[PDB]
């Protein structure tokens, strides 16, 4: 009976810890996903801005 009781209490404790990790992980990963979404958008206008002046300078 003592082994059964200690097994039950340790099972409850580890389930609590697992849920404590689980609740954090989802939003922790979602925030970084949202941040990377912004990262993907950066390099758009730079290409045109850099190429137009080079083309005009080559024309001259």
């Amino acid at each position: 009976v003592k082994q059964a009781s200690i097994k039950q209490i340790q099972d409850a404790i580890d389930l609590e810890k697992s849920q404590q990790a689980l609740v954090q992980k989802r939003h922790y990963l979602f925030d970084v996903q949202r941040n990377n979404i912004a990262m993907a958008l950066e390099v758009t206008y730079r290409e045109r801005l850099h190429r137009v002046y080079k083309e005009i300078k080559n024309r001259l």
């Binding site: 039950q8 609590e16 970084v32 949202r34 912004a38 950066e42 758009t44 002046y53």
Partner: protein
């Protein structure tokens, strides 16, 4: 062209663990590295045009002054980021779902903690009743105890 602020690609970036999407996360990390390299490759804006020196070195008449006038009038546009807003809305919906899941898990955790406390307190004396022991260890119906 100031760079958009972003959080560091910490271990939480790999914590996504999307279903058959770890390759997608690796591709996103590669995109971030390539974007950083491209940003470091060139300055924020292209170099200025030495129009005065150009005209001094331009023997042609008309084809040079009009070219400089057009270059001054030239105004390259900038790309749109509607997909960024759409992905932000999708991330917001995912965050709402995660918040609902976290609330449900917190309720389950409260229930589990209450059950653990009840089990710890209800132990009492070892000299309990046989029926009382069924709270944490009950028997079954007929044709169950094979051995």
């Amino acid at each position: 062209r100031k760079l958009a602020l972003k959080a560091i690609d910490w271990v939480a970036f790999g914590e996504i663990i999307p279903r058959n999407q770890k390759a997608i996360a690796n591709s996103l990390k590669s995109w971030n590295e390539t974007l950083s390299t491209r940003l470091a490759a060139l300055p924020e804006k292209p170099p200025a045009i030495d129009w005065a020196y150009y005209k001094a070195t331009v023997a042609k008449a008309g084809l040079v002054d009009d070219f400089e006038k057009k270059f001054n009038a030239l105004k390259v546009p900038v790309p749109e980021d509607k997909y960024t807003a759409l992905v932000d809305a999708e991330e917001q919906e995912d965050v709402k779902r995660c918040a609902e899941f976290l609330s449900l898990s917190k309720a389950r955790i409260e229930a589990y903690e209450k059950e653990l406390e009840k089990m710890k307190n209800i132990i009492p004396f070892d000299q309990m009743t046989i029926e009382d022991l069924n709270e944490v260890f009950p028997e079954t119906k007929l044709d169950k105890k094979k051995y």
